[PDB]
Structures are given as structure tokens and as C-alpha cells.
Design a protein around this ligand. Sequence first.
Ligand SMILES: COc1ccc2ncc(F)c([C@@H](O)C[C@H]3OC[C@H](NCc4ccc5c(c4)OCCO5)CO3)c2c1
Ligand SMILES: [Cl-]
Ligand SMILES: [Cl-]
Ligand SMILES: [Cl-]
Ligand SMILES: [Mn+2]
Ligand SMILES: [Mn+2]
Lengths: 675, 674
Amino acid sequence: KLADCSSKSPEECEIFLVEGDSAGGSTKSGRDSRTQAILPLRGKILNVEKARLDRILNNNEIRQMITAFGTGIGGDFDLAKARYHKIVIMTDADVDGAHIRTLLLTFFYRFMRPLIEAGYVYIAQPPTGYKGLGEMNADQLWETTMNPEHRALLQVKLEDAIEADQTFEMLMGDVVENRRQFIEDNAVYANSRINERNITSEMRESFLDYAMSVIVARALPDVRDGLKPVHRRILYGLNEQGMTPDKSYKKSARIVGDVMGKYHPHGDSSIYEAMVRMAQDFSYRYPLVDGQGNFGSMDGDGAAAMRFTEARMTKITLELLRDINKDTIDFIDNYDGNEREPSVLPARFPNLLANGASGIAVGMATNIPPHNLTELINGVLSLSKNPDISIAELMEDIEGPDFPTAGLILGKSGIRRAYETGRGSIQMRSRAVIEERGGGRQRIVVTEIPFQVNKARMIEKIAELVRDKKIDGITDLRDETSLRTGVRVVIDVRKDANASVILNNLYKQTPLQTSFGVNMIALVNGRPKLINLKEALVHYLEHQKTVVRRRTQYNLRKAKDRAHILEGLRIALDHIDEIISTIRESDTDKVAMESLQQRFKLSEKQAQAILDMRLRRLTGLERDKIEAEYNELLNYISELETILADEEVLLQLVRDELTEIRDRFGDDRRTEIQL
Amino acid sequence: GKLADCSSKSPEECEIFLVEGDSAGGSTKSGRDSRTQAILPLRGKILNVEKARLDRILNNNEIRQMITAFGTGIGGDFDLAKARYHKIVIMTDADVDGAHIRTLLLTFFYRFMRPLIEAGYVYIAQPPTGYKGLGEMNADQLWETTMNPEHRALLQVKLEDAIEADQTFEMLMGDVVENRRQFIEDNAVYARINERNITSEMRESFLDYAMSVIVARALPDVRDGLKPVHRRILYGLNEQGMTPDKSYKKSARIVGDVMGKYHPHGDSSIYEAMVRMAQDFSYRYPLVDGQGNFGSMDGDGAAAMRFTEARMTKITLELLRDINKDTIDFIDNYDGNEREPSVLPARFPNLLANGASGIAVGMATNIPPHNLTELINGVLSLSKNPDISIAELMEDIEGPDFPTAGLILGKSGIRRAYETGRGSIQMRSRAVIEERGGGRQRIVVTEIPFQVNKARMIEKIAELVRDKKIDGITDLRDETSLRTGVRVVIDVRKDANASVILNNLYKQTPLQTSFGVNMIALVNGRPKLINLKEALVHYLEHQKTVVRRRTQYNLRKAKDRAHILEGLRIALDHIDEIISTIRESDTDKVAMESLQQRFKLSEKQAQAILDMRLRRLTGLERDKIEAEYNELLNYISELETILADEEVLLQLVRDELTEIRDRFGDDRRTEIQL
DNA sequence: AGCCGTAGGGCCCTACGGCT
DNA sequence: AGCCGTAGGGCCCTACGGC
Ligand SMILES: COc1ccc2ncc(F)c([C@@H](O)C[C@H]3OC[C@H](NCc4ccc5c(c4)OCCO5)CO3)c2c1
Ligand SMILES: [Cl-]
Ligand SMILES: [Cl-]
Ligand SMILES: [Cl-]
Ligand SMILES: [Mn+2]
Ligand SMILES: [Mn+2]
């Protein structure tokens, strides 16, 4: 893949490292083929600080870099055997390019340190605003990044070797705590020309950029709507295109393309997979996407290519987006500044706990189980009537997690500790039974598997335990699952063998029993925070108060404006002859504006609304419609002002709407909790 | 492997379904009955055994997986008793490509498992139409409509005449194209366990796929010179107004919009089509303006469509000009939820301007690009003399003009190609011999032939030098750059004749390449081999029809607006009685009737009055109405004049074509040496 | 050959944290 | 010692005709 240069004089040669062929194209097209070589990599490279040496020396990209440099590694390193005197790191100008840069620097530092000490490692500075170099034209990339007469390179300098070792081991090592602490200490949450660059400063700044971006803008959900940026951008994308349940499905290809061009500047696989997960009833306790086609199965089967499937909203997603266009939530600019996206959805039901979450960030992660919507809402209502409610009282309503795959939970200890601190292991067990099958023989029937368990992989594991004789008593192992019966895994037992013992062994040796490690970390005020049940419900309730409040304010301003216009039009109808006369005798529409305003004490917008009136509106029924709309509008205004007068009426309104959602979408519990 | 076998092991009641891929294997595996129904997902088009040799067949993954799944062997080692299933159900997608796949599968079974067909073990599923594939259906639907034995409708393949079957498979699937082309020409019609004869299935399915590829994939239309994918792309860029004046648009949005609206096929085909249309070394007149990495002459593909952007070129507007003026017939799309153009107005001769290249079924096409100035000059000459000959046209259209410049040797091949539609044209690189210091010389190549991969050519030369198949070359370099352009340097050994080396390179490398002109195009939706004059004729007739329908559209529009303006002049002449008439009316319908009866107004006129905004009652508005009405009368007169005499119509076509020439015409790039 | 260009179809490397 | 789920990145079979 290396696109070497013509010259073979390392003193004037230089190799550029890019993320892939999408960038290698523009780079190869704009380069100077006499003294500039190009090595396209394949995305994220291996982290040598965590992987073992055998895996490093067998990695394709690593070996290709060693070959390209021809200097060796470790003790066999020879600076004189360098085929280039400048190794230019030129990743994409994004957070992932920063991560890649930190990985590359780690490799060079752990296996080619003299290359850094000699000042052979440089950093290219492509302009910002591009998702990658593949989006830039060749001439632009040449003039702004590669042309020696205009480029601005940073030469990597190694000052303190001890602080460098500590930095690389801290940020890239396998000890998470040091990294989390670094983030906590340095994270700044938002509410020709060859400069030298200290490798420590570059590692800390780049890795901090990637880490922050992953924490606040990728892996972790927001406590208010319980959504990550990709899911939020997906659903909003389905909203701006009117992909409502009443209207037909929409082509998944169009959805992913629109979302990717407008809001989510990342690969299609991430978006489409996210939507697929949101459409699967075995993954989402309350699915947010209605899918047409093959959206996978419990056996790990992925979804069909997006070019075959379609999707629209679910009825409850409408409740996630309800009132989003009434100044309830703050919009923000997108990545390219050509669109507006919601920073959060109204989330008229507690989504975070309803569907749960699970994300692997940097220096931390999150794992929240789903719950029953009825129980959640009942808990919110109890909290609204008692700010001092305790966790146990909440648990009178919220018995515990409620997984879409049903199943069993052993004991409330793990639940209790998880709701009281935000961390706790919960023992999930399949629903299995023992029954006869004729001739004094027995079998074990599994009808419900644990949450996030691959059924086919489980059955495969059992087949292994049977083959290796690591479990005795099993004679046959079938999977009679079907749509007309549901999950049904049959495990024949050998005659005269105790099936309960075999079952306990299966619980001990297979995913038939799995633990869920609750670790409820979520974004609060745009900051990662470990929260308990009460805090989550509280932040959600506050979000609801703010939502309904801002909605009432919006509807009030709108209603008042419409009331003013309707007043202008009612005046016009009371003096239609005077109006017509005023207009006809005016040469221009501006003169008509001024004359109407001055003669009828009308505002600019009222005279404008009169000038825009169609003659058909002078028919009787149209006048009646205007009057009626005005009176009803006065009543509506009075009701709104009533809501904004007393906070108890507002809060009770939140209670009423939450109760409506509960009565409409609430369902029975699926997962049984045994004492 | 990918096989998802069933629980039972009794072949008499077992049955295996063959699907095109995993997107369908998902729905099939979710909706099946896992006790007696197995599933084998393939990987798209399988190998055509009628054409491939045994070594290639026995190393194909899908073939071997099918043999394994059946467990019967192949050839003479076939044993029906070892069959793991008694029903091999072919269930490809309900489309033309699924029909092609079906013919391939049937071919394999017939040449390697004939007793399986004789015993009636091969069946064909009949999934409902309207889905791009089974991956678009839900599992319950697929089960109830196709797999459920209590309602499905299978076709059992029966082999009656073995001789006619052999001749059929050798004819449709064999490696002799002429027989296949003849079959298409003779049978192509261009616009519950039933038994099914394998011959009828092969002929019908293969004819379906063949027709679809000929008229709806590989071959262009003579009028706009576009294939369905390019037309649907450009139209897609037009429905969102992604014009050159506006900023670029994300390629992902373009491909998604086109694929959901018009082109129900893979994203790779669409995106590659747009990329080619954006490449200045591929299109003599690029129709797409690309932002990002859209490839190079060294075969380097374009960046993923998540990085690149694209909009129209200024000349594409001339392809779309007057589209909304009833110039071209619109049609329904594949799902019946959209309208697409069957052809673009094509205000300049695109087919010959950018050329074409397509591999269909039973035939193919290869048309070189040309110079727009010369083409237009030829069209104008033709409009003044229907009896013009090929040589006269060649007085204007000297020959092909490739975007890569280059050289063409002699007009013999050109002349034969323009006269008959078929002809070889010798393209030669632009090479020179120059000194490089110390009595040594080099060969500098600055222009390569059309559709030649520069890096691959250089590799070929390196091979000839390494293999000692050519003497005199000492070094080889590619000094190409944006500041210089194509520049391949070939050092010559001192005291060696460089002209001989250059001639040898022309004889032994792509430095000289042949272009096999084979101008086949769709005329009235039928493939036809055409010459230069015929192409120019069909195009000119398309222009005449376009401008005619445009003039008619503008005439009807102008007359309608004049009628409305008459109504409005009446309304303003009696504004008081109008207002009173409306006020006394309860409903808008009553007002309509009263106005019509009291002022001799039509429905649309009274409607236009009722929809009039009060701002239109200012004094100056009446004057504006009068002026617009008079100018409209003059305009009507001009239009009717144009539609009265065909000579002024043709002269208008000449005027617009001349304007296009003056705006977009450019100099010739390829030199033609005698 | 093996390439041209529209079509069918699909799988494998990496980072990151926590639990097993 | 391997999975969960958002992210970075990419390559290889096939049909079809003509030279
Ligand atoms: C599929 O299995 C493999 C196996 C091996 C592969 N080797 C290299 C390799 F690059 C790949 C993949 O990139 C090939 C391909 O590109 C990316 C994906 N495009 C799908 C798509 C469709 C429609 C769209 C869209 C994206 O974006 C927005 C608008 O509409 C799918 O996969 C490989 C893939
Ligand atoms: Cl934290
Ligand atoms: Cl209106
Ligand atoms: Cl079409
Ligand atoms: Mn990138
Ligand atoms: Mn298909």
C-alpha cells in the first residue's frame, strides 16, 4: 500500500501517514512524488501499551510501518538505516485523528525512541472543517499541508523522559483509574515555520480531546432524555422528514444518508446499527423505531443491508419528540454550521431508565438496565408529591429492572444497592423448567434467556460442554424456537439422571445465568456523573417542569400574536368600506401600509395582515370563522396565563400528562423478581 | 458454514431453501419452521458453469457449499439416495437479478445434478412482488406467503425433452454470444404445486433479465445519451436544486435520495456512476462537480461517499433545461410513489459528446466522446440538408476527441466507424524524445490513451524491461504532478536509438491502444446499431420535439394567464360591486356562482378574484395588469407564429444550439495524424 | 489474459471499561 | 480471554461482451 517516492536520499525524503485510502487518494494526488512517500493505515492502530509483544510483531499495520522505515525496533534499531528523515503524522483533523495520533506516538515511543530523539517525527496541520482529508481537494491539501513553502509542521521534541514514561503509561496504559483521574483534573466541560512540540503536551492535549469528545458526545447518554447523540440525531432525523407512524415507512438508506449529511458526521455502520438496535424488541424495552424488513434476531444475526429495510417512528417516539417545535428545548448549530439540531429531546416519559443504556467511554463506562414504564411513572408521580421521598419508598413502585427478554432476578440485594449508590451486580437467570417427555425420561425447557445474551452462542457453549464431557446427563440439545411459540430450547436429560443438578450446573457453567453490573453513569449538566435512582428521577422531573413551562410560554406568545392579527382583521371587517377606500386611493402598498396604520391605529403586522387578506374571507362563514377563532383564542390565552400563574397547576399538569402516557403505553412487568 | 440446517434428519420431509444472501437469510431463518426447513444463503451471482471450466467450478465457495449441503456428489458420482433433502427450493429475490440467479442455479443443477431434476426434487418459490428483496419482508409475511406448506405455491421443475433442454442451456448460458443475441431478437417483446418446464423457465427468466439489462441498465438512450442510473442521479440532483450556484451537497444524501426515490440497487453502482461523471479524465464534458477525492488515472478509486460532496456542472443545466415545461414524458418509479423522467431534454448531443460504454446481455456498446463544437456544427449542417453524407459531416466532425487528449492514427477507422457504426480507432500516447545531459536521451509521455490506467501501463513497461523483452531502457519514472500533469519519463541507454524503443513500446504496451467503436444505442426503447448520421438525426428530432412541446406548454400557460387577467380587469373595473357581491354571499361557492353569472366569468376567473389580496387594489396594480396582459398578447402571437411554420421552429433550434456552442464549446484535444 | 462499468452479495482488523 | 456498542478503516467473489 506504500506509495514510495522517486528519490532515495533520506536527507530530503519524507513519508506521510494517513488514516486510509480516502485520504491516501488526495495525498497521492497532491503530493510531490519526488520526495514525498505515503503510507495509508487502516483506522485505529494497536495500542502497544496494552497488547502483548507477540500480537504487536504480528500486526499488519505495525509491520508495514517497520518495513517502510527499515530501521528495526527495540535494541535492533539503527537510525542510519532510516529511509526517511521526516515521519509526518497526518491524521484527519478530528477527535479520532487525535486518538490515532496518540496511538502512533505511543508506538514510536515504545519501539523507536531514537527516531523521536533525533527529531524525525513531525505532525501535519491540515485545516479544520473537514471530516477527513478525503473531503479536501488535492491542490488545497498540497498548498495548506504538504507544500514545504507554506506548510506548518510541528517537530516532536522529547524533553523529560521520566515524565514522558509516566504520561504514556498514564494515558495509554491499562490502569483506568489514573486516566479517569487525569480527565477529572483536566476536563474543561462546556458549562519554513517549524515549531517545536513537547511530546507530553501533545499526548495530554490530544488524548484529552478524544476522551472529552467520547464522554460528552458519543458513548454516554444524557439523564434528561436518556439518549446518546447518535440516537437523538437519528430520531430527530425521522422527525424532520415527517416519518411518523401514520405515514408509510421510509427507506433506511435515506434516513442514514440524511442523518449523516445533516447531523452525524460519522460512518454509516454506526448510525444504521444504532437504528437497528432501537427497532429490536429484544434489545429495547420500549422500541423507538418501527422497522420493515430483517432487523436481526437473538442469534447474533445482524440486520439486512440498509438498502433493503425501511423504518419509521413508533407511537412512543412521538412522545419523545412531542412539543419539540415549541421552544421547549434549546437548539444548537451542527458540525458544519449549515443546520440546527436539538441538544436534547423533550422526553415526555423517562427514557433513560425505560430502555436503559450501556456505553464504553474513556476512563469510564455506563451500564443502566431497562425498567417498567408504569412503575417508573408511578415513581415520578410519588416524587412529585414528596421531594423528601426515600429510595425504599420509590422501590415500593419501582420493584427493579424489567428486561424485554423477561427472565428472572435473584434477590433484591443487588437491586437495592444499585438504586442506593448507582453500582451493583444483579443476578439474572433464564426461565427454565423440568418436565417429562415419555418413558421415564426428562428434559429441560428454556423459554426466556437473560438480557443481552446471544441464544445461538449459548447453545454452542452447551454443545461444547457436552462434547468435552464437562457436564454429564445431557443427551440431546435442540432449539425449537419459532415465531408461533417463541424462545424454546430443549435439553434432553439421560434417564435416571437428576435434572435439577444438571440445571444448576448449566446455571454455573453457561450464560443461562448472567450477571448485570449496574453502573449508572450519565451526563448531568453535560458532565459525567454516577447517579442513583432518586437523582435520575429528579433530573427527569425537573426537565419535565422546564419543558411544559417553556411550552406554555411559547403557546402564550403565539396565541397573543395571533390575537393581535385577528384584532386587526376584525377592525378591517368592521370598516371594510373605509379599508377598501384607503387602499384604492394609495399608489403603492407602502402608502397603503402607512395610511391604514395611521387611520386605524394598527401596527405594522396588522396592516400587513390586512393587505394580505383574500377577498374570499369576506364571505359570511369566513367572518364567522375569524370571530370564533378569536374568542376560542381568548379562552386559550386565559387558560395558559392560569397555568403560568401558579406552579402547583403546572406541576399537576405534568402529573396529568405523565398519567396519560402511563395509561396509553404502560405494560405489565416481564422480568420476575424472586425473594 | 452459512448453512442453517434443520433438526430432523429424514430427507423425505426435509427441504432446503436457497436465498441470494444473508439479508434474506435473516427473514427466512426467522420465519421458517426449523424442524424440516433448512436454509443456505449464497453470495449474489454464482458461477456460470456452462462457461467456466471444472477447476474453476470445484473451487467456488458457493458451489462447494451447495454440494456439501446436498451430499449427493456431482457428475458420474451422483447418488440420489444420499440426498439430505427431497426439496431444493430456489427462492431468489422477486426481481430480474433473482431471475438471472435462478437461471444460473438451474444451469448448475442441470449440468452436475440432473437426476435431482429428473426425480422432481428441485422446486421454485414464488415470493410476492413489490419488495427489493426478501430482506425487506417481515418473517411472518415470508412464512405465510411463501414457506408455509399450507398456503405456499411451489413450482416443481420437470424435464421433458432432454435434447431441447441441452440446446436451451447451451444457447442461453453457453459462451457463443450470437445465438443468445438471436434468441433475444426473436423473442424480445420491447414495450397448489404447479409443474414448470425447465426450458420455459430458462427462456422466460433469462429473457426477462436480458431485456432488463438491455433497456434498463447497460445501454444509453440515443436522445440524451444517458443510462437509467445517470439520468436518475442527475434528476436527483435537480429535485433538490443542487445547482452550481448553490453550495455542494453530501454524496451520502445524494446516493440515499436517489436509491430511495428512483434507483433500487446497490449504493456502489450509484456512487461509482456519479464519481465517473465527476472525473475530467473520464468525461469529455463532466456532468458532476466533485468536492474531495474522486479518483485518479492510476486506478485509485474515490474516497468513501461519507467524505465527498457533489453538485451539478453548469453544462448539466443544459441537460435539464426546460424539463418542467412538458418537454419530456414522465413515468412512475419502481414503487409507484414518485415520478421520474423517462428522458432528459438534452439541449446538447450528450451521447456523442461524452460517449458511452456498457456490457449488456447478448450485445455491448462502446461510443467514444467527441468535441461539442464539432458535434453542434454537424447538427446545424444536418438541419440545413437532410441528404448530407458522412464525408460532409466529417468536414465538421473530424473524429473522436478524448478527454485525455492523445493521438489518433488515420481517418480510416474513424471513417468506417462513422459510416457503419463499428470500427477500430488507434489511439497513441503523446510521446517525444529529448536530451537529458551527457549525450543521453529520454522519452517523455504527457498524454495517454483514453480509458488507460497510467500506473498499470507503467507496470507493464517495467515488466517488459525486467523480463528482457525490450532493450535500451535504463530507468522508468512517473513525474506526474498537479503543477505538471501527466509526465512519464523513460530513460534510454546511451548510444541507443530512442525512436526504435518508442515504436517497440507502441507495439508491446498500452502506450498505443485500440478503441473498438461499436455504437449501439436505444432507439424507441430498442437496441440498435447506428452510424454517425443516424445518431445526429435522432438527436435533432428529439430537439425539434422538445422545443415544440415547450412552445405548446408556454402557449397554454400564457393563454390561461391572459384569461385570468381578463377576469381581474373586470374585477377592478367593478371593484365595488365585486366586494358587495362577496359580502352578501354566505359561502365561497355562492360567491363563485354570483360572480360568474353577473360578470360572465369562468370558474377559474371567479376563483382568481376570490383569491385576490387586497394589496392588489392599489392604483398602480391595474396598470401593471394591463401591461402584463398586452405583453402576454404579443408573446402569444410569437408562440403561435413559431408553431405555425416548421422552418422558424427549426431555426429556433439552430439559435439555441448555437448559443450552447458559443457558451460551452471548446478546442479539440486529440490530434488526428494522417 | 484481463480490463472496461453497471449489477448481485458479503467480513474482518482496531480503541475503549467492566464483568465474567 | 471474550462480550457488550459506538467509533476509525478497508477488499474480494460473481455475470455480462469484445478485443
Ligand atoms: C459487507 O461486507 C464486507 C466485506 C468485506 C469488505 N471489505 C472492505 C470494505 F471496504 C467493505 C465495506 O466497506 C463495503 C461496504 O462499504 C460500506 C457500507 N456501505 C453501505 C451503504 C449503503 C447505502 C448508503 C450508505 C452506505 O451510506 C449512506 C447512504 O446510503 C457497506 O459495506 C467490506 C464489506
Ligand atoms: Cl467520573
Ligand atoms: Cl392565506
Ligand atoms: Cl428510465
Ligand atoms: Mn477518518
Ligand atoms: Mn438480492
